[PDB]
Subunit: 335 residues, 4 copies
């Protein structure tokens, strides 16, 4: 009855601070905050927690987000170097690490980001046992495997951002060619995210009309329309953005926001994300690559068995062998 808060507000219950739709982002770099602002403007999280080892930059990014509290609906934004703020997250998004491509890349950086996951995954899983881990850092297909091993979590709950973006890039350029919104051009990229992704031209379609129906040479070099160069631009428009601005952040953030929605809302949408493919498309080793997956509140609940044709399945398996030896290429350093 002396202070303003006491005079104006009668507390009836002690407020809960155990959110029930909570998101932690680990790594508040370009990709991390792109994820953050996108998750915030779509109101996909009750509480958003941020983790990083740059204690100063982490505190600054969090305050900047907080000062926008009036303009979105996430009611609690927190941060800290100790993973206790991670506690009881529905989804933990891992964005930490150096910037690099996949497949053909220097092991020093591949191993550096592997070291980062060894540091964080044990804690992340301790404080959020029932969470799904959504791996974004690159090489994404390899770190998702690494995380899954360290975490000891079910394979269904450890997911790589994979080719969700690749397919979005794919659908954007198809749309430009045809003059149609990407939401209406349908086309799938699978396998490795980045340099050696596999386009499945058999399925590229509009309104159910296979495009290779209209152009039997779609995706071959013989094609006089040069549709295959779309796939090469899918791959290299990424490289080009890095050249021109130095990194990629905006589209991946939207891609993560796409996946986070499907998981939390339990939509059971199909997305090309990285899951473990042993026992699928003739794969007999334990490795992670992108295939079409049904995504729900429990992570990957089902997967789609696209019947790959001989050319597609060959590249898929080649890429699978690539990652396999690189997964083997970290084990031999961790003697």
């Amino acid at each position: 009855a002396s202070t303003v808060k006491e005079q104006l507000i009668e507390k009836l219950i002690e407020d809960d601070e155990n959110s029930q739709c909570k998101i932690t982002i680990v790594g508040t770099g370009a990709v991390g905050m792109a994820c953050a602002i996108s998750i915030l403007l779509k109101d996909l999280a009750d509480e958003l927690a941020l983790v990083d080892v740059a204690e100063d930059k982490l505190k600054g990014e969090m305050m900047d987000l907080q000062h926008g509290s009036l303009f979105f609906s996430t009611s609690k934004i927190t941060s800290g170097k100790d993973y206790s703020v991670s506690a009881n997250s529905r989804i933990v998004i891992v964005t930490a690490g150096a910037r690099q491509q996949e497949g053909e890349t220097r092991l020093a950086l591949v191993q550096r980001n592997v070291a980062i996951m060894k540091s964080i995954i044990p804690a992340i899983v301790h404080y959020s046992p029932d969470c799904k881990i959504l791996v974004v850092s690159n090489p994404v297909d390899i770190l998702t495997y690494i995380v899954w091993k360290i975490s000891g979590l079910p394979v269904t709950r450890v997911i790589g951002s994979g080719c969700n973006l690749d397919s979005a890039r794919f659908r954007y350029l198809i749309g430009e060619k045809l003059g149609v919104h990407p939401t209406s051009c349908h086309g799938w990229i699978i396998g490795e995210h980045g340099d050696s992704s596999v386009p499945l031209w058999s399925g590229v379609n509009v309104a159910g009309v296979a495009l290779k129906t209209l152009d039997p040479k779609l995706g071959t070099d013989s094609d006089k329309e040069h549709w295959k160069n779309i796939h090469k631009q899918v791959i290299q428009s990424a490289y080009e953005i890095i050249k021109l601005k130095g990194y990629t952040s905006w589209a991946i953030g939207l891609s993560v926001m796409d996946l986070v929605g499907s998981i939390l809302k339990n939509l059971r949408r199909v997305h090309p994300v990285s899951t473990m493919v042993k026992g699928l498309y003739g794969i007999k080793e334990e490795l992670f690559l992108s295939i079409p997956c049904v995504l729900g509140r429990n992570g990957v609940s089902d997967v789609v068995k696209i019947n790959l044709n001989s050319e597609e399945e060959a590249l898929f398996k080649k890429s699978a062998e690539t990652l396999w030896n690189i997964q083997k290429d970290l084990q031999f350093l961790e003697h």
Copy 2:
């Protein structure tokens, strides 16, 4: 081997543990107004509908499900048995007969609460119950005593809608969006609602500061008719259209959002006010409460002035004497 078997390899058994479920009880005008508003704001992972009119309930539910491709709610269910309402975070009660705040009809809707509230709480023990049916301040009290739940988790839609009307009419008079015109209606949802001209303001400027007879009959601008309209707009609508659906659906959707997202926003909703403004009995009336994931976590203590407190305490007793008649 089926298409599904050949197309889709099951990896885990999909859960029916909806982490953000909502049930609406009574799929009438107000019920499905709430339903569609909740659906287009993606505030629920699962939406369950319950009614005694089996045929209407199934038609409503199917009509909603056919629109699944245009919203994000993944599961819509219906049923006369309250098992389908299990594990809702919020149950919105809109069942009843169209009414106001004669007693034959008040008991008619009290009969309904006595038969639904037990099964509702049984299947969703941690839920919040948002009472919309009228008399809302009465039935919220009835529902609370039936449920045996904490007082902070039974909430009447109350004067959220009253205040939304109050601000719309203040906005038209001033030429400003209702969001930027602030004003409060508390007490009864209905004919004895209490306007707080004390705090009616734009940009922090108390309006009565600029016209000190604001809200009196003396007033030359006659702002007190905006309150008369707050009350008579509802009656007018009911004469012209037959009922009220859209605004109250929106008001419910507003409250549901503060609760589920635990925003801790202040809304004028019906809670039990024993201990405030010299209220000595157990009755529910709208006052400014802080809404979060547990319902009312805090209430605001507005120091009602000479005349405001009078009608609030009158508004209060009107109800208390309607309640005691069993």
Copy 3:
């Protein structure tokens, strides 16, 4: 001096040039289902309602305006005179009697179009007209000839809703969200709709690839009953609830979004198909069109197979012979 005069200094005269206005004609079940769906997706700066039922029209409009504080549309207006519909970018026609695709009732709704479409186009010369009333493929043609507008700017809601049902039922059978199950219904909105099992697919996998008798009576899985349901779901709903409102409102809101935001998405909507699939006369039927800020800017040329083309051309003639009867 008033509160407004003392509070607010006018700097310019506020314009009534709504740059994103929408009119709904016919504030019935379907009319106001469209209305609330448009309002909660913030697709219109101004929403205008027109009807012959003055009293209902004013009650509906007021009930919407009282919710102004919960959505972003700044102005809601009504009126029996079509002047209030002036300068809409889209006019959605939902007026008429509940019907199907007897002729006494078809002429009944044609009587309506003849009396509204002239005033509509007069006041909104650059608008798109989205026809929802049934028979939709018929009335879209009627409206087009009355309006004198380009064919690309008169559009029937058509089989957007049909296809949304098609995908919902394919999704329940497979356990996948309707957005990820792709399938197309074209031709008549109603009983003679044509399913294109050719292109029904998930993740690009043609479903008939996995079960080559997909969509036949021979089929052991009996997928052809999902199409029967697409048609009979509507009838079922009408028997149980009395009418259909929510899904079609959502489908209209989907189309309105592609148009206003000029997204160039492909929807199966009713356009005039003279020249395609050997259609020789002027009739409207649903096929995949690209929707943008001018309505239909492009149409997709699906090479209908042996049997599909047959029923589409049959579906087509059914209508042409209903039209010629004045």
Copy 4:
């Protein structure tokens, strides 16, 4: 009948490329793209055009946004150094320039950003004559004046982002103190954006309850609750974010997104933005400061006459004199 597009799509009309809700952002730095991603995830624009003089960074930021096309609804994203892409914008957002505070700041940077506006405003106004210009670059109250003079546009159509963010910061910290969502704490900052802003404690309230009603010493030093230090933190939490992360981007972007919504949707909401205040609160010179303004499709249609008390009006007028001489401090360099 040979190519896929010809075979699959029959063009009936030539597609329009004259958007009718278009936004140009000038300056694709931290603030510019924060604005961009926020405008995109709220679907406030049919078309979004980007302008900058860093041709490479501009091209990269635009492609990155484009690759997310599948996840939002803005159907055309464009960029270019030539202001023809600005053409027929409803709103042009100016985010270009060096980073600096207001009032007490080095003239070399104030003049540098003044030079930038001289370069762009003539073109911007040539290609979008009926547009509103929303000025974000700092010092914001001075550049908004500068822009308005150069543009020759009506005063109602040239708006500074001003204290919309300041008030959001203000409402966020009030909310923390009281444990209430900022949307429900109401409190206004006006005048200079940044170092010398004026808090109006007379109006700070919850549910219509003035807080100084409950604490007559609210906002004085004598206050045992030290509510005034909230205002000092409003001011210096900005400084602190710059120290910790190097700049501010996220909250201002959300603040601009707030204002863009009110303008395009013609909401007629009241926001504290910078308009020209000559003839208001005793001001007799031509200068720009933030007061509560009604914002609609035509810019500032009305303004609110808060009756400032003697202490408030004194600081408002002092700050007004500050900007006045600095507006005079650029004229004497532009001999």
